Amino acid sequence: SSAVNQENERLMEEYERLASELLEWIRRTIPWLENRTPEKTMQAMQKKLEDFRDYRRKHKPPKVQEKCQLEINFNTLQTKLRISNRPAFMPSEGKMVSDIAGAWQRLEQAEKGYEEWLLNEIRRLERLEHLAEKFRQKASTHETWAYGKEQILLQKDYESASLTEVRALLRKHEAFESDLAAHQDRVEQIAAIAQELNELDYHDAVNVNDRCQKICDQWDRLGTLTQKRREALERMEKLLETIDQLHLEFAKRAAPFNNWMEGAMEDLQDMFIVHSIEEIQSLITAHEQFKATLPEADGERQSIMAIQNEVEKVIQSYNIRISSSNPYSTVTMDELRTKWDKVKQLVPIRDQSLQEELARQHANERLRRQFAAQANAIGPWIQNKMEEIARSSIQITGALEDQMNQLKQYEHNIINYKNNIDKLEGDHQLIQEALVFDNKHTNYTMEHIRVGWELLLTTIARTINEVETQILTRD
Amino acid sequence: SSAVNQENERLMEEYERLASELLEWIRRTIPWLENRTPEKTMQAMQKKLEDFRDYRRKHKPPKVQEKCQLEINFNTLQTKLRISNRPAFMPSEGKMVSDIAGAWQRLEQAEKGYEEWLLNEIRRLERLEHLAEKFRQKASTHETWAYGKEQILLQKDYESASLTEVRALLRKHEAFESDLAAHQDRVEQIAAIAQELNELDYHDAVNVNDRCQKICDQWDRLGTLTQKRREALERMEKLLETIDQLHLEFAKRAAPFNNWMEGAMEDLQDMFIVHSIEEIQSLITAHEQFKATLPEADGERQSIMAIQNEVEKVIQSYNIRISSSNPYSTVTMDELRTKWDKVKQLVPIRDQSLQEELARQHANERLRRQFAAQANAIGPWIQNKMEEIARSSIQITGALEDQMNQLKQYEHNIINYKNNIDKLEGDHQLIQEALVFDNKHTNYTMEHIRVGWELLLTTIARTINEVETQILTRD
């Protein structure tokens, strides 16, 4: 009888030693799950899932078949104690047989979404770890590109530059603008990566947001810093372009004008030699016409001096480099004036010179005329007396005494006419001393008169003589 | 009787003392005229004419009246000795009375064109003295202008010049040409004055002809010397203009091309992350298309390297200054190549990178498929057995023993199917270790199978148990 009671004890003691053995597991296990305390890296957060596998795979199943094994024992030892009759057993209250239904429903609870969690974290640390590294890299290459760019952008090289040098920098600046717009994208990306990096509560979101902020701030500063340059370069080009135009204009006009002044200075000093009033007057008509051009000449002079003034003005009103000196022209504005002064100074000297010759020529004509007037009278007078002597033979009375009487009267006329020949002779001397050897106002010439007068004096002498013989070789 | 003979002696002695007194004058005078020995200056040559005046005016006339006075005496003492009868006198044979007609015709000869001469000389020394002074002056101002002109014309300043500097000198050279043509006339005049100066036997014709010759020789040398310059300057401008064009072209093309290389280097290194074969293939299609552009990329590369070569060539084939360096561009041809090499070096690294991910994704799909295949079989298998157990009550014979017989057979099937669940579990672990958490090839998931299989094991255990009670609370 107690032989059956011996195993009906082990078959009810079996329950205890096991039903408990389980209960303490759902005890030690419900805390392990339920945890959900995130991890640092991903590589460590997945080792946490490898633990869950080992659990749900090799540790939890055997328990499920033990939760079932029990209650099966709570029957093979229940319905069995009915077929032997002697009230069964509902052991340890601290090991209920209808409550392990809760102790497991407990574990099942704490396990709820644990793997769902584990995964999502593996996946966040997935993207995260990637973006972090991408950010670190995409930023580093940008920061490296940026180094010094702002500084060189502030350099002012272009102040002492030439129209072409500036024009060149302007073109290299185009390159810079080009390259600048290139990276526009990289900046937007660097922002975006830092952005998402936040959304995923990246542990270092703080520092990436800062590093990114600097980059975006710089980018903006860089943008306008780049625009200042274009403006300055574009402005500098404008000025130099203007100053160049002026210089050019000045050169194109000072040249010809310098030739004119040089030409004039020569003309106003050209040596001349004349011998007639008409000649010296052509020289006067000429000089007169020249002086007539002096007005507009001064026009051009001032006009040119204007061009120079603007140049020197725009330069001065921009404290800009580039020696006012004109690359396209040799002659200065200051030496341009000295020349003009000379022209001027030479004019009064020229006409004063022209004036004296005019007087000279006129003085010469006077001598010419005065000589002509007298010779034109003396000439015929001498001719007339020759004729009077050539006659004298006639006489109504019968020659000799009456012819003599007449000859002596002519001699008296002759004698009394001498002073006229003298005068002539004297004005002749003046004509020659004046280097005048042409006289269109008479066909005479001191010589003709001399011979004529000398012939006259000889003819009377001869004739009076012949008549003296007559009144002798007869009387 | 001898009272009349006393004055008829003085009136015949009068003849002698005078007729002689004259004869010696035409003697001393014929040599004075006849002279015609030119003089130095004009001022002295006219003092020679002032002598002639004094002669022909106050010295010669009185003699003419003395030549006449005689012969008149040769009659008042001839016809007179007839009216007293006693043969007259024809005195001194060395004092003829019919020959003073020749002694005077002699003087008249020697006087011939003496004044005509004197004048013409006054007139030659007139023009002469003027031209000489004009020459001396017009030459001096030219020689002064010329000093140094030839030297500065030979200066080569323009070698190390810039396109603009040369372009400037070229324009200042225009001025020089202008001013040069200006004096063309002055030279022609200087020649002419020396010319005439000869025609008038200028005493210094020798030296003026030399001084003039130099001037004309210089003028010619000056002319061509001036033309060399224009050519050199025009030539230099040509070169610099060409070299500039090239530099410019190079700059306009190296810029964009430099942006491309920089852009590529980035793309070929851009970090990426994928989770599907489709994703990694888009990355491959892209990279493939990029590489497709590499050919023409090299085209442009070489083309640009060409431009540089010509530049460096024309320079080198004219031993011309101007550092080959490109004013319009920063990036060098040598650093341009280093970049290109980098692009190249990065390609094989990129596809090698792209290659590994493709393998990874494929490896992943394999695990995905292998898992699906098994789960899609195990799933229904577990479902089917639940149904077989769910029945088993039937039996044509009348439950229990025959139902049990069947339950035990199912248990045996279950047991023998376990290895399948194991495998699954193991490929599950691979899928997770590969960071693959998506599987479109099955609607199962390791979990579903676990629960299912665990439910199965519990259902048979339970059922076989319940049937054990049956065959007890009946048997």
Side-chain angles (χ1 to χ4, degrees), chain A residues 409-422:
Chain A
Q409 157 177 46
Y410 294 161
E411 180 169 52
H412 181 269
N413 296 330
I414 309 292
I415 285 186
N416 176 61
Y417 198 75
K418 178 185 159 57
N419 72 303
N420 297 306
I421 306 301
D422 267 73

Side-chain angles (χ1 to χ4, degrees), chain A residues 164-222:
Chain A
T164 291
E165 299 170 297
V166 159
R167 215 101 76 147
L169 319 165
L170 202 44
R171 196 179 302 287
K172 306 185 75 175
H173 182 71
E174 174 140 297
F176 187 102
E177 277 164 358
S178 193
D179 172 297
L180 197 285
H183 311 306
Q184 172 55 56
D185 191 53
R186 182 168 63 198
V187 179
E188 324 221 18
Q189 276 179 55
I190 291 199
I193 300 187
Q195 163 78 291
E196 178 176 355
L197 235 35
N198 255 314
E199 295 160 359
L200 284 44
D201 288 297
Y202 176 29
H203 86 286
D204 206 359
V206 206
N207 301 67
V208 329
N209 273 317
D210 187 63
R211 185 169 178 184
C212 175
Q213 189 56 240
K214 300 190 182 184
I215 292 182
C216 290
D217 281 345
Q218 180 188 237
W219 191 245
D220 294 339
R221 173 152 68 282
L222 232 23

